Amino acid sequence: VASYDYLVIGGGSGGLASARRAAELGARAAVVESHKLGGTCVNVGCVPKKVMWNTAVHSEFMHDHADYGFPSCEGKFNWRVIKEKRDAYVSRLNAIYQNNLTKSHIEIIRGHAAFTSDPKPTIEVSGKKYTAPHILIATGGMPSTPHESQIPGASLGITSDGFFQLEELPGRSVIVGAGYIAVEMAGILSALGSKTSLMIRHDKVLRSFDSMISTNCTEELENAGVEVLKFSQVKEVKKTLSGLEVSMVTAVPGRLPVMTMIPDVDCLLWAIGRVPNTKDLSLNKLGIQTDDKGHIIVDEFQNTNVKGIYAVGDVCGKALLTPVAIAAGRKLAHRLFEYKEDSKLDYNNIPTVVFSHPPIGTVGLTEDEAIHKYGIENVKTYSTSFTPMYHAVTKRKTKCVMKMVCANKEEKVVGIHMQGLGCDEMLQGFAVAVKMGATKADFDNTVAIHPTSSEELVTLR
Amino acid sequence: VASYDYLVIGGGSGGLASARRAAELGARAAVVESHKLGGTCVNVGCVPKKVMWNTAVHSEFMHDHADYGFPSCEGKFNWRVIKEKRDAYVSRLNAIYQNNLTKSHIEIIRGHAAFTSDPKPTIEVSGKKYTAPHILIATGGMPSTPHESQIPGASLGITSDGFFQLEELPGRSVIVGAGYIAVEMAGILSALGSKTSLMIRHDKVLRSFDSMISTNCTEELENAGVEVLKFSQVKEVKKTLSGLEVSMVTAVPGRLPVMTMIPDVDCLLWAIGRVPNTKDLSLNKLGIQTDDKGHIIVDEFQNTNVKGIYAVGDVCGKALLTPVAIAAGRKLAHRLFEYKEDSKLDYNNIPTVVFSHPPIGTVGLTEDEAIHKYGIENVKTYSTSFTPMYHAVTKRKTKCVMKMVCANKEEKVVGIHMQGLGCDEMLQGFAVAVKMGATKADFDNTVAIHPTSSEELVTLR
Numbered sequence: 001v002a003s004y005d006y007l008v009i010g011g012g013s014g015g016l017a018s019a020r021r022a023a024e025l026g027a028r029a030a031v032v033e034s035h036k037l038g039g040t041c042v043n044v045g046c047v048p049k050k051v052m053w054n055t056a057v058h059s060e061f062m063h064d065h066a067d068y069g070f071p072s073c074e075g076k077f078n079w080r081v082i083k084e085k086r087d088a089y090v091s092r093l094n095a096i097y098q099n100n101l102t103k104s105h106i107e108i109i110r111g112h113a114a115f116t117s118d119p120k121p122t123i124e125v126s127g128k129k130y131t132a133p134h135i136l137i138a139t140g141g142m143p144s145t146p147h148e149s150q151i152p153g154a155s156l157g158i159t160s161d162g163f164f165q166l167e168e169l170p171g172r173s174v175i176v177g178a179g180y181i182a183v184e185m186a187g188i189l190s191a192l193g194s195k196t197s198l199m200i201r202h203d204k205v206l207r208s209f210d211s212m213i214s215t216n217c218t219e220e221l222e223n224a225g226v227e228v229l230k231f232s233q234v235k236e237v238k239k240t241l242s243g244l245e246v247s248m249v250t251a252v253p254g255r256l257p258v259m260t261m262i263p264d265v266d267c268l269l270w271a272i273g274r275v276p277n278t279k280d281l282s283l284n285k286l287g288i289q290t291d292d293k294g295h296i297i298v299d300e301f302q303n304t305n306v307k308g309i310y311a312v313g314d315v316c317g318k319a320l321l322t323p324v325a326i327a328a329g330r331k332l333a334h335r336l337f338e339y340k341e342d343s344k345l346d347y348n349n350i351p352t353v354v355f356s357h358p359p360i361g362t363v364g365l366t367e368d369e370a371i372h373k374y375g376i377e378n379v380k381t382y383s384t385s386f387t388p389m390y391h392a393v394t395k396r397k398t399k400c401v402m403k404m405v406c407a408n409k410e411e412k413v414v415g416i417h418m419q420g421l422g423c424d425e426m427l428q429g430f431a432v433a434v435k436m437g438a439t440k441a442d443f444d445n446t447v448a449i450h451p452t453s454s455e456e457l458v459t460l461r
Numbered sequence: 462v463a464s465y466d467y468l469v470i471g472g473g474s475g476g477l478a479s480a481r482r483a484a485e486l487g488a489r490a491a492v493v494e495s496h497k498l499g500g501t502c503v504n505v506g507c508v509p510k511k512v513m514w515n516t517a518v519h520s521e522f523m524h525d526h527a528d529y530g531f532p533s534c535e536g537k538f539n540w541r542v543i544k545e546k547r548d549a550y551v552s553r554l555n556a557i558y559q560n561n562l563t564k565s566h567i568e569i570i571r572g573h574a575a576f577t578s579d580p581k582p583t584i585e586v587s588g589k590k591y592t593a594p595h596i597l598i599a600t601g602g603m604p605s606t607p608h609e610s611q612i613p614g615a616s617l618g619i620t621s622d623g624f625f626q627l628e629e630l631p632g633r634s635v636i637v638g639a640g641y642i643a644v645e646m647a648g649i650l651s652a653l654g655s656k657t658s659l660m661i662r663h664d665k666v667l668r669s670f671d672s673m674i675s676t677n678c679t680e681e682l683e684n685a686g687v688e689v690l691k692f693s694q695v696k697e698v699k700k701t702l703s704g705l706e707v708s709m710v711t712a713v714p715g716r717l718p719v720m721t722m723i724p725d726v727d728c729l730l731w732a733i734g735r736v737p738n739t740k741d742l743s744l745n746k747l748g749i750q751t752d753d754k755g756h757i758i759v760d761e762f763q764n765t766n767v768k769g770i771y772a773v774g775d776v777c778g779k780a781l782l783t784p785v786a787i788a789a790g791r792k793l794a795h796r797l798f799e800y801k802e803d804s805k806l807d808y809n810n811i812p813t814v815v816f817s818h819p820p821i822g823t824v825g826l827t828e829d830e831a832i833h834k835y836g837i838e839n840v841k842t843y844s845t846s847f848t849p850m851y852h853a854v855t856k857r858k859t860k861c862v863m864k865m866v867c868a869n870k871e872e873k874v875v876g877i878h879m880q881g882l883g884c885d886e887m888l889q890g891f892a893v894a895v896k897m898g899a900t901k902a903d904f905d906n907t908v909a910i911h912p913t914s915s916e917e918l919v920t921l922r
């Protein structure tokens with residue numbers, strides 16, 4: 001049995017970051033990866049998604065050419081052109097992350113790892129065993145699909161995984177789900193010319209976000225040509241001559257349930273959740289604790305219930321973001337290999353961007369969350385809504401909405417929420433300020449940058 | 462003589478903001494304006510500049526259409542189309558600012574004000590006199606042009622003022638100056654198809670900015686097709702058959718001076734400085750103090766040397782930005798009309814964006830400024846340079862450069878400097894953090910937003 005200081009299962013965001021930082025501290029480390037380095041984000045996540053978003057963004061701005069004094073464009077978007085370049089870029093990234101490991105002198109173990117029943121924590125890959133005083137589980141998750149038993153034909157639909165295998169633009173797309181991935185997918189497919197529907201269980205998307213964002217994002221989706229099918233879910237999917245037929249039930253409150261057949265669907269995309277990647281880890285061989293969804297349970301230091309075994313990232317089911325897996329991974333490395341006992345990730349005030357159109361930026365508590373935590377008497381929100389001067393000369397419009405959530409007498413900024421042009425690049429700095437415990441006076445004492453959208457956040461009244 | 466609590470000379474950024482805030486505090490206020498409300502920013506500054514920048518940005522991104530799988534565009538940009546819409550937008554803004562005053566119950570006095578010799582501070586407009594215990598001078602400035610005596614034919618050139626009167630795209634443009642206005646003008650004219658030169662006295666533009674920015678911006682200008690004429694200045698301008706001939710002298714260090722004639726120039730644009738608007742104020746009638754350039758001298762509370770007379774904004778020659786005039790104006794209002802004796806503008810850590818291509822964002826001290834202030838032993842800078850993943854699929858490239866300047870053991874962030882896509886909307890939040898006295902750990906403790914350019918500022922090493 002080959003022994004290391006650090007065995008890391010999964011060469012994705014969390015695994016790579018943690019192994020690399022451990023190695024910097026002197027650890028003899030190995031990374032196990034059954035597929036491609038970079039994991040979900042690089043291969044079927046953040047990176048390819050962003051490239052597709054950028055493409056969609058081009059399509060959106062192109063509508064404004066004539067308004068800006070430019071001749072109109074020629075017609076045909078070509079999905080295949082961007083797909084090939086996206087693929088190549090992902091390949092470049094894979095090669096880069098492989099090299100990062102090697103130059104870090106981190107061993108790369110190719111294959112699927114599973115734990116053994118061996119007393120001291122030990123894994124097996126392709127018949128070979130490996131052990132370490134410290135084993136990180138960073139296996140991530142994967143897209144959820146409905147069982148055939150619940151929804152006959154569901155397997156005819158694809159997921160975000162399949163999305164990145166698409167070779168052509170689907171003529172007609174139905175996206176099922178109301179979370180950020182669903183929204184991003186629908187927004188991209190629609191902007192690029194797919195006749196797109198987004199099917200949601202209630203009245204708005206992003207219901208976990210601040211209500212202003214939930215409302216605005218749903219509206220902007222509709223304004224952009226995305227058909228939002230409210231209080232609707234899939235009952236069955238059937239293969240037809242032209243593509244797929246989606247039978248859905250719509251049950252709007254105050255109305256009667258009605259079943260509708262959606263014909264001629266080229267692409268049915270399930271975006272209804274992620275399942276952790278733990279099924280084949282043989283976690284039970286060591287009594288490693290999971291929840292009923294298969295998420296690995298950890299304390300605030302990413303410890304599992306078993307000594308010498310840790311978990312970070314999507315596999316733990318909390319804040320499923322690349323930078324979060326990375327930060328928890330690095331904090332863990334510092335704790336184990338720099339003996340910083342207090343080293344852990346603070347899961348409060350993690351910023352998120354949703355790449356809708358326009359993009360969404362959020363950090364901290366929703367207004368409701370603040371209300372519950374501080375008391376309605378101790379929360380004061382400031383908000384504004386405007387049309388960015390970018391649109392001063394266009395017939396097409398998007399809105400910018402901003403909300404600042406303040407708590408207590410000092411008006412501590414405990415939440416910032418926004419959607420609008422530039423909001424994707426706008427958030428990071430404000431997240432630093434919020435992390436620092438900025439009050440509203442801190443914002444107001446900061447001189448504005450004009451003319452930008454961002455200045456509106458430091459001149460709210 | 463009509464008496465008020467507050468007489469404000471100039472209905473621009475600083476004047477409007479100060480009068481409006483005074484009025485909120487109950488002041489009986491009047492604003493004198495000889496031309497259009499909104500002053501320089503609305504009429505011949507920030508707003509129209511930004512619209513033109515947005516137009517130029519379209520042109521830049523259009524080069525990337527085919528790379529993103531879109532058909533190429535048709536050819537002819539039409540300046541006249543955007544000019545008309547820009548003009549209309551400026552007209553809407555004028556009407557808005559007029560209305561803001563009226564709804565604030567601020568009297569609008571149309572005409573040119575000048576002080577009288579009357580003992581108690583009094584102004585005259587169109588033969589009528591007005592007085593107040595508090596008179597704000599907020600007259601702004603105007604573009605500098607060389608005297609014919611120094612440069613024969615200089616009056617054949619225009620300034621940024623003339624820029625916004627242009628009805629067509631000049632075929633050939635020469636911009637003289639190295640500051641942000643020069644850079645923005647050249648960048649816009651060039652992006653829109655003008656054969657553009659930018660003539661600078663030394664080797665780089667923006668020499669007052671951090672050296673990284675000065676260097677990068679000069680390079681990006683060249684990469685974008687702007688001819689940067691280094692160590693060059695105009696000796697004479699002559700009207701020719703086709704347009705203008707610009708005779709310039711170039712004196713590169715280590716070389717001999719050489720005179721070059723630039724023929725067929727349609728647009729020669731002077732952007733070599735701003736002169737304060739004080740010449741016809743009859744400041745001498747009250748002994749109001751100015752410098753040799755005509756700037757009104759003030760203390761930290763915007764007091765002139767004369768009791769009951771104040772000045773804010775470009776007329777004082779310090780930090781010539783709209784948000785600065787606004788903030789100094791409002792702080793002044795609070796001091797005078799809410800009796801907040803400590804109310805004043807902090808002129809440190811004012812953020813600036815330069816709308817080059819890509820945009821520049823800066824706040825705090827350059828590296829050299831930090832070095833001088835803290836000692837080279839007490840300054841640590843972090844920097845990075847990358848190509849934004851937006852360009853992962855394009856043949857055209859721009860860079861993103863970021864520098865964080867840290868001082869002392871705590872590594873207080875005393876400067877942030879950057880150029881790159883999205884940097885215009887990125888800066889504001891970081892400016893709030895820097896104002897708060899953020900250290901590098903504050904940045905590093907902030908979870909990244911991925912994939913963005915902005916995340917690079919919280920993961921510098």
Ligand SMILES: Cc1cc2nc3c(=O)[nH]c(=O)nc-3n(C[C@H](O)[C@H](O)[C@H](O)COP(=O)(O)OP(=O)(O)OC[C@H]3O[C@@H](n4cnc5c(N)ncnc54)[C@H](O)[C@@H]3O)c2cc1C
Nearest residue numbers: 010012013014034039040041045113140313314320321322
């Ligand atoms: C469509 C989509 C878009 C997204 N966009 C963003 C975004 O814009 N910004 C953002 O912050 N996040 C985004 N995410 C989230 C993101 O990608 C994840 O949060 C991230 O990948 C989690 O890191 P991880 O290390 O936990 O898991 P992963 O990055 O998925 O890596 C886990 C790895 O372990 C391997 N593996 C699993 N089991 C084993 C085993 N038994 N043996 C050996 N190897 C194994 C896998 O093959 C894989 O490479 C997106 C996700 C999706 C699906």
Ligand SMILES: Cc1cc2nc3c(=O)[nH]c(=O)nc-3n(C[C@H](O)[C@H](O)[C@H](O)COP(=O)(O)OP(=O)(O)OC[C@H]3O[C@@H](n4cnc5c(N)ncnc54)[C@H](O)[C@@H]3O)c2cc1C
Nearest residue numbers: 471473474475495500501506507574601774775781782783
């Ligand atoms: C081309 C250009 C682009 C710019 N872009 C930006 C930018 O993107 N961001 C930014 O923060 N700043 C920008 N600026 C700077 C900006 O516009 C000024 O800093 C701002 O206008 C200053 O405010 P002010 O109140 O001091 O002067 P002004 O806004 O110029 O207002 C002064 C006013 O007083 C009036 N006036 C003058 N004398 C008298 C008198 N004797 N009697 C009656 N009325 C009088 C004038 O007609 C005028 O309306 C730009 C400037 C230029 C020239």
Ligand SMILES: Cn1c2cccc(=O)c-2nc2ccccc21
Nearest residue numbers: 054057058061515518519522523
């Ligand atoms: C931010 N931005 C873009 C981002 C990505 C792709 C574009 O094509 C684009 N075009 C633009 C046009 C005008 C103003 C901004 C713009």
